[PDB]
Structure 1
Amino acid sequence: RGSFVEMVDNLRGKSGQGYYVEMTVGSPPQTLNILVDTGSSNFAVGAAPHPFLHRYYQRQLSSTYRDLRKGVYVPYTQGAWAGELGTDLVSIPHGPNVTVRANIAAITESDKFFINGSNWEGILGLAYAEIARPDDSLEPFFDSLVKQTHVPNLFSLQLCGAVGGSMIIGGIDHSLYTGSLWYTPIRREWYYEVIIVRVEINGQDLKMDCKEYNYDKSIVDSGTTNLRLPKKVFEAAVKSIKAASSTEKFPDGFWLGEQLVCWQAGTTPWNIFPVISLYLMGEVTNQSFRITILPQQYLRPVETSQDDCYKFAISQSSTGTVMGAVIMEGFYVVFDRARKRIGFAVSACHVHDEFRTAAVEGPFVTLDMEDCGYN
């Protein structure tokens, strides 16, 4: 068995409402289910009763909790919460064998943040300090782990869609992928920002200037469900996806996520929808690689038991490209913070059919990639 076996299958998800890991806080121990989010940088836990929460953090019962005498408020693209800052002992029982004192926000009120039936009770922001609230002086959890212990500065995510997966902390487990890992640079340590240099649908280049694909940033975000694309890119990609799936027409609201379409259980005609490839900047000058997803990744099930209903989960953004769970469920993704790069390989758990699989291929030659990023 590989050396990281005890961290394999440490994530769960309930009906596609977010992937979470168990974390144990305080003394004596309180274990809670915590959503894994590479799109933010605060660690925060429900800390008062809420109708969607089975468990919450009870600070008064932890003798090692320290109050930082400061409130915090975090708004996201979806939802927001407010709470109080402090520190406490934190361990991940199916994660690294260490315990660290970390900052923790105890959430006392929230709006449209917790999700009914999702089973998670807090959020682990794995991005960098630049985007933490109240500001970049509040050390994020992964920074605490690497400063206090000798766990290598890397983690990897395998999100397994329809729900579970693995977060390997401090290394890479070779059982979780097939083929080779291909790396793209982290452009700047704030979000996990990357540069997309070409987009194809069904093998056809969308032929927009690459500056449009990264206006004003492109990021890898396990806390967002969809692949979210800037306005001009979203409109062009939908027109091309429609053109490539013209054996059937679907109501316009389906491509806006407003309508669902359902098929008799097990009969969804995946072949009528195209594959979608993103090319990413590689590690050598003028070299790129591509990651390709299937409709099984970008059509998401919505849970009669004899019907399989789906929502189209590519959507519009006014804040750049967000490579959310629709992209990450195709791949084993290695967040190699020590070497400032993100690795992709085909996931051993990605959903596919007998005709097509997700892919990571390269190298391709793409010139002037340094022009694609926003400044």
Structure 2
Amino acid sequence: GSFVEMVDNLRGKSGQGYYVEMTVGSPPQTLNILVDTGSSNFAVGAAPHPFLHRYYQRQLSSTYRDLRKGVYVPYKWEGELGTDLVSIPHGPNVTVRANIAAITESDKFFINGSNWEGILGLAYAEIARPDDSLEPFFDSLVKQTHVPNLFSLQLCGAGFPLNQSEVLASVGGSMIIGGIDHSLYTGSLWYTPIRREWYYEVIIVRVEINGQDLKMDCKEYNYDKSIVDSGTTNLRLPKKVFEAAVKSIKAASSTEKFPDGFWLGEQLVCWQAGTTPWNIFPVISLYLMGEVTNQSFRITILPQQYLRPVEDVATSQDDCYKFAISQSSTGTVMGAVIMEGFYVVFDRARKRIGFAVSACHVHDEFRTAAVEGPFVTLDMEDCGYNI
């Protein structure tokens, strides 16, 4: 581990997000910021909100600069654009002037009890709002300092429910800015190409449930795109893929019958303390395009990743979970529960994303998550979707 100052700098969980501490303004105003590889705007609460116990106060920063431009981002938050000096206390020892969207109005954005007051969009300018002329934070960081154009994320799910006090005192993972820390993973790093620089887009070429090929035209897996998104909780799949995957997961776990509400990801299922039947649920393997022509590799997750720990509505001693795989109308999304199984390297400089088994992934004595390769795979370019 060569980046000890950034190791363990994250807090949070898959259901509400993982955040890093940042400071904005002069003198520095400390705020907790959601790490989101699925968006490209740095935006912070800048006005009182029932779910915020602190926010960015522009009139108290001597380095605040008003851009005299508004921005509306519906998913929903509205803000006022400006720039200010920004730092990451447990990160690179540098201060940069970055664009900041001061959130003045929001609907269903700030989550009661998540502990974050803003969002750090780490994707590319092409999807920045209002348009690509608003330089994203990481682009500003790299242009203004000597920090290498790469960051890596280790998101650590606890494997069990964390109450409001525990989630504030618990280490949720690491965001290494400008490098790769070898203590955060085991085995080798396998890289898949970033197809296009907007979202962190990748190409899935094969899907297996307990080794059984889902057998779908691989274009279906990336319809209309496949991205790595730390700002989303679930592994989400295109309608047709979700329907085929749920049917296969139900068949593999058929020794136990679960209510439709469970497979819809809406209702929790509980087992007597310590008896969760992990072994009846299948592992899921996603094969990704490799960097070598006709070569692919696979990442395999366990039900310990796709079943999300939740506190029983009775706070009992039962171990409960919600199914963390859901249908998508916007393509495949490898959300937080999938990233919790791996150390993910966003190698912007080499236009590639690396995956390695996470040193903090939850597993049991019989199975572990995996990143394995290589596999000979043909015509993988045809797996990509073109509008």
Please indicate, yes or no, whether the TM-score normalized by the shorter chain is above 0.5: yes
State the SS of the aligned residue for 1:158.
strand
Shift of residue 14, structure 1, vs aligned partner = 5.6
Aligned partners of 2:239, 2:13: CA distance in 1, in Å?
Answer: 31
Shift of residue 309, structure 1, vs aligned partner = 1.5
Aligned partners of 2:267, 2:97: CA distance in 1, in Å?
Answer: 46
State the SS of the aligned residue for 1:297.
helix
Shift of residue 64, structure 1, vs aligned partner = 0.2
State the SS of the aligned residue for 1:350.
coil
Aligned partners of 1:279, 1:326: CA distance in 2, in Å?
Answer: 17
Shift of residue 301, structure 1, vs aligned partner = 1.2
State the SS of the aligned residue for 1:181.
strand
Is the contact between residue 14 and residue 117 of structure 1 (CA under 8 Å) also seen in structure 2?
no
State the SS of the aligned residue for 2:13.
coil
Question: Relative to 1, partners in 2 of residues 1:288 and 1:14: Cα closer, same or farther, differing over 3 Å?
Answer: closer
State the SS of the aligned residue for 1:211.
helix
Shift of residue 30, structure 1, vs aligned partner = 0.2
Shift of residue 3, structure 1, vs aligned partner = 2.7
Deviation digits for residues 65-93 of structure 1, max 9, x if unmatched?
000000011123xxxx0010000000000
Structure 1 residue runs of 4 or more that deviate by more than 2 Å after TM superposition: none
Shift of residue 263, structure 1, vs aligned partner = 1.3
**Which residue of 179, 183, 187 corresponds with 1:179?**
187
How many aligned positions are there? 370
Shift of residue 265, structure 1, vs aligned partner = 2.1
Please list, as runs of the form range in 1=range in 2, the aligned pairs for 1:257-268 lying within 5 A after superposition. 257-268=265-276
Deviation digits for residues 212-237 of structure 1, max 9, x if unmatched?
00010000000000001000000000
Aligned partners of 1:94, 1:258: CA distance in 2, in Å?
Answer: 36
Q: Give aligned-pair identity as a percent.
A: 100
For structure 2, the residue ranges without an aligned partner over 5 or more in a row are 159-170
State the SS of the aligned residue for 1:48.
coil
Worse-superposed segment, 249-258 or 173-182: 249-258
**Which residue of 244, 262, 286 corresponds with 1:278?**
286
Residue 289 of structure 1 aligns with which residue?
Answer: 297
Question: Relative to 1, partners in 2 of residues 1:161 and 1:276: Cα closer, same or farther, differing over 3 Å?
Answer: same
Is the contact between residue 234 and residue 326 of structure 2 (CA under 8 Å) also seen in structure 1?
yes
TM-score (norm 1): 0.97
State the SS of the aligned residue for 2:349.
helix
RMSD: 0.9
Matched, 1:67 2:66: yes
Is the contact between residue 330 and residue 347 of structure 1 (CA under 8 Å) also seen in structure 2?
yes
Worse-superposed segment, 9-18 or 173-182: 9-18
Is the contact between residue 15 and residue 118 of structure 1 (CA under 8 Å) also seen in structure 2?
no
Aligned partners of 2:126, 2:12: CA distance in 1, in Å?
Answer: 28
Shift of residue 15, structure 1, vs aligned partner = 7.8
Shift of residue 251, structure 1, vs aligned partner = 1.0
Deviation digits for residues 82-107 of structure 1, max 9, x if unmatched?
01000000000001111000000000
Deviation digits for residues 8-38 of structure 1, max 9, x if unmatched?
0000016841100000100011010000000
Is the contact between residue 14 and residue 119 of structure 1 (CA under 8 Å) also seen in structure 2?
no
For structure 1, the residue ranges without an aligned partner over 5 or more in a row are none
Shift of residue 305, structure 1, vs aligned partner = 3.9
State the SS of the aligned residue for 2:247.
helix
Question: Relative to 1, partners in 2 of residues 1:345 and 1:308: Cα closer, same or farther, differing over 3 Å?
Answer: same
Is the contact between residue 16 and residue 161 of structure 1 (CA under 8 Å) also seen in structure 2?
no
TM-score (norm 2): 0.94
Deviation digits for residues 151-171 of structure 1, max 9, x if unmatched?
000000000002600000000
Shift of residue 258, structure 1, vs aligned partner = 2.2
Deviation digits for residues 296-329 of structure 1, max 9, x if unmatched?
1000011224022210010001010001012100
Aligned partners of 1:107, 1:305: CA distance in 2, in Å?
Answer: 39
Deviation digits for residues 311-353 of structure 1, max 9, x if unmatched?
0010001010001012100000000000000000000000011
Deviation digits for residues 235-274 of structure 1, max 9, x if unmatched?
0000000011111111122111122111122221111100
Is the contact between residue 286 and residue 367 of structure 1 (CA under 8 Å) also seen in structure 2?
yes
Question: Relative to 1, partners in 2 of residues 1:316 and 1:11: Cα closer, same or farther, differing over 3 Å?
Answer: same
